[PDB]
Amino acid sequence: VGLVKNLALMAYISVGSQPSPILEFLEEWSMENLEEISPAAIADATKIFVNGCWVGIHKDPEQLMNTLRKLRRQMDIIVSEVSMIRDIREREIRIYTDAGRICRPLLIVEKQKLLLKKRHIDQLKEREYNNYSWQDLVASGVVEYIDTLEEETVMLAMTPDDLQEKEVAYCSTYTHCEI
């Protein structure tokens, strides 16, 4: 009891990916290497980790995380199974490209609206004719794979009814919605 477990329906486990495209992007995006910094820079910078290696520091972690997410949502140099966690209080950005992470797809919310729109459903309803697929839905930046370690940082609507205006607002800054 409890020791043997079974996957949830939409759970996917990462197969693993090489980190070098991300290290190459980070060095081209104002990350400073440990061998170059002075230690006095570390107190107000953010530590960047990739697969647990502390690779550098960065001085504006919000714009970095926005850029990294914008890459992942575009099928760019960051593949969909890469986790990217900002610990705001600790000043750590941790990026994971390793195998064996358990993850699941979530819908992206921006400004309290789903990015999923009628034109997506209307394309999916003729999937057998138009060859539009789940992969196109991920490539459009509508669905995102989120790991348990990244869920700590996510704000989840249980349904789009949580996104509506209410007589008292519990939360007004949701990042994702359950399918």
Partner: protein, 108 residues
């Protein structure tokens, strides 16, 4: 399926390259390098030695192991003195059989 496909496509080759080349010396000395894997489709060899493609239901009925032969390119170089070396490449040396996951990319 994806985990098995990553094992066949990437991990076996990495393991074969990551192993150190092996040096032998009595003086004349030899070193061998393992450089490239190949995996066929599942095949079975009958008592006459002829290969044929084994389907999974034959493996279930005859109690066979559904597996494919793995090959590696091996280079041997011979060393002693004067750079009087030579290399022999023993291409596709049969190294063993790998059990194949059904419906994987390497299944029939």
């Amino acid at each position: 399926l994806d985990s098995f496909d990553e094992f066949i496509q990437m991990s076996v080759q990495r393991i074969v390259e990551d192993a150190p080349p092996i040096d032998l010396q009595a003086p004349p000395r030899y070193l061998l390098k393992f450089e490239q894997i190949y995996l066929s489709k599942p095949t079975h060899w009958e008592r006459d030695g002829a290969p044929s493609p084994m389907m999974p239901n034959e493996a279930r009925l005859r109690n066979l192991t559904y597996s494919a032969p793995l090959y590696v390119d091996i280079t041997k170089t011979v060393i002693k003195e004067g750079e009087e070396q030579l290399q022999t490449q023993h291409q596709k040396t049969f190294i063993g059989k790998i059990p194949i996951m059904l419906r994987s990319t390497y299944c029939l």
